[PDB]
């Protein structure tokens, strides 16, 4: 029986995992344009700033 260990995504702004029916978003980096930035619903509602992992660009 194969154990298909998927990689549950994690938000960048806070680091919390993404529950199934969350209204989270995933989009390409705003300055390096290759890193995927996740944003969880809690991070989305109050719109706390996020930082890129690659270029260190800051963007709400």
Partner RNA sequence: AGUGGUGGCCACUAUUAUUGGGCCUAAAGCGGCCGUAGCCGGGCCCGUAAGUCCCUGGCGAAAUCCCACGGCUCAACCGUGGG
Partner RNA sequence: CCCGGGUAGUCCUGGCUGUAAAGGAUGCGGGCUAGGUGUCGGGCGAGCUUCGAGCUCGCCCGGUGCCGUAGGGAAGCCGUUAA
User: Quick one: 2 or 45, whose CB is closer to RNA?
Assistant: 45
Helices (H), the chain: 41-46
Neighbours of 11 (CB within 10 A): 22
**At closest approach, how far in Å is the CB of 10 from another protein?**
9
Site for another protein in 2-41 (CB under 8 A): 3-9, 13-28, 30-31, 33, 39
Pick one of 35, 45, 52, 54: the residue that binds another protein (CB under 8 A): 45
State how far the alpha carbon of 14 is from the alpha carbons of 4, 19, 36, 57, in Å: 26, 14, 15, 16
The answer to whether 45 contacts RNA (rule: CB under 7 A) is yes
């Amino acid at each position: 029986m194969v154990e298909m260990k998927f990689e549950i995504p994690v938000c960048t702004s806070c680091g919390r995992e993404i529950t199934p029916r969350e209204h989270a978003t995933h989009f390409i980096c705003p300055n390096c344009g290759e890193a995927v930035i996740w944003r969880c619903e809690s991070c989305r509602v109050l719109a706390k700033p996020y930082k890129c992992p690659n270029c260190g660009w800051e963007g709400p």
